[PDB]
Design a protein around this ligand. Sequence first.
Ligand SMILES: *[C@@H]1O[C@H](CO)[C@@H](O[C@@H]2O[C@H](CO)[C@@H](O)[C@H](O)[C@H]2NC(C)=O)[C@H](O)[C@H]1NC(C)=O
Ligand SMILES: *[P@@](=O)(CCCCCC)O[C@H]1C[C@@H](C)CC[C@@H]1C(C)C
Ligand SMILES: *[C@@H]1O[C@H](CO)[C@@H](O)[C@H](O)[C@H]1NC(C)=O
Ligand SMILES: [Ca+2]
Ligand SMILES: [Ca+2]
Length: 534
Amino acid sequence: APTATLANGDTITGLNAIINEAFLGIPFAEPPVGNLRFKDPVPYSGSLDGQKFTSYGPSCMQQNPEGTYEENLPKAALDLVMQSKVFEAVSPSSEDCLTINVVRPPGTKAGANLPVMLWIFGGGFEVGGTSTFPPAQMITKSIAMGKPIIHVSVNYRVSSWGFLAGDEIKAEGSANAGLKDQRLGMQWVADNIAAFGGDPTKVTIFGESAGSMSVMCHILWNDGDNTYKGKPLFRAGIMQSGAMVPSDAVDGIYGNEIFDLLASNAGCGSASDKLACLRGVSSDTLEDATNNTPGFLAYSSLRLSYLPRPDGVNITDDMYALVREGKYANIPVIIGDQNDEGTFFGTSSLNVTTDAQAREYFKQSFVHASDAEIDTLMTAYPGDITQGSPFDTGILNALTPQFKRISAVLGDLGFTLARRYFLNHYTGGTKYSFLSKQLSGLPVLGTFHSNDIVFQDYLLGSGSLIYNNAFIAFATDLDPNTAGLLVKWPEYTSSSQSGNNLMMINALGLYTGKDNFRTAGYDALFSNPPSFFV
Ligand SMILES: *[C@@H]1O[C@H](CO)[C@@H](O[C@@H]2O[C@H](CO)[C@@H](O)[C@H](O)[C@H]2NC(C)=O)[C@H](O)[C@H]1NC(C)=O
Ligand SMILES: *[P@@](=O)(CCCCCC)O[C@H]1C[C@@H](C)CC[C@@H]1C(C)C
Ligand SMILES: *[C@@H]1O[C@H](CO)[C@@H](O)[C@H](O)[C@H]1NC(C)=O
Ligand SMILES: [Ca+2]
Ligand SMILES: [Ca+2]
């Protein structure tokens, strides 16, 4: 029933889900298979005329989050699960996965010109798909608010398939393939969304975790030039847990070690041209070799095997330097965090129980950090269990004498304080920041990383006021205050500003606070950002 005529004259049919109309699985690029592997996406050249788009297509190949060159139970078990016919059935994945999904309010028509919210999923740049982030909660609330929006989601390559680095990839001009996938989808939205009733000039990009860092990367792309055919690709961005990526260049030391490890694993350790050898191995072999490099939940943790890295061409430099140097798109932004962002990552090093061990783990993790810096870091984040994350839980959650400490460091460097650094240097437009404490008291994890996904897509809670309502008003009017919330969200100018600069959330509701916590950790970490790059 639902129909749309694209920018090339093709008329496609979607699905009527009663509460919304959706067009799922629209191919936006030519399948990145064979010799197209690891390469930039090629625009989809073909005809969709007469086709129905009523189901999500498969996700891109996934990597075992517990993957590693080592052997163990978590790895073995997840592999058992991931290769199961039942898993392969409920959650299909493939190298041919570059599709886009359009979901809208019922009765929407071409010319409606509704604001567009483009979702970029998070999955540690190693797993993930669009199908697991239902847009219905957001769409329904938008209608109820009288501020209807259209939800767009894009599949992008993850893990080795989307983020392979090293000397060969650099020389070839193929770095950050997964981000390029996201970029093409944006371009597809500019060219076709009007046919669906969206306004290509009212696009707000948003993601969580890896998707959020992806949003920051888009703000930094091509030194801030976000135009396509003369017009900006998006008027705003919402970053849920994640800002700049703390990483070395594509041809840096870890980018290359990982490339070589994967090559040995696929049986290309002897190839004169390892990259050409990698294009020739079957999907099985490649999936296997990849599952034998660390996953984001493995001991390596934050020191990820695959993630966005500066390439000197599309992301021209260290991401912290670009932000300092003003090389970003000038747009209004919302960027927030959950109180306890690092408790998940802290679960990866529960065999680290003494301070001597904590010092070596950090040393292993941050190869560019001097002993002085490691020592400053370990003073800024003391062993005192009352000081760590879950924050403000006293002597509880002492899985080990280092869990709370390690959880505090990782969540701050990767998200929470990284956000403050951005906020303190960004002048491209109005800023709004939030800190959630909605799940205070939840054992072991606290107000954990990802909980916002629940309250944005699955259940309603005090947080939904922000994750849905406030986010909908911002995409529509560029001011979250138009949502008519009882607590006015203050503009964030600086972390040193007087007065509350943070919207906050607790189980009962909203309130405002200050972004002045853990200042010693901020300076321990960000006085010279490159000391803690991976
Ligand atoms: C905690 O566990 C990790 C993971 O096994 C240990 O690190 C591995 O140790 C083996 C044996 O020495 C090495 O071959 C691997 O290279 C290490 N893995 C990684 C990912 O680095 C680590 O030594 C243990 N830590 C403590 C404090 O016991
Ligand atoms: P994000 O996608 C992790 C990004 C790590 C960046 C380091 C440079 O992680 C969460 C994604 C979410 C959708 C589910 C759970 C994930 C972890 C917090 C476990
Ligand atoms: C990457 O950079 C080059 C050089 O500026 C540019 O021509 C190319 O179009 C960029 N890629 C993307 C996806 O924007
Ligand atoms: Ca090499
Ligand atoms: Ca500038």
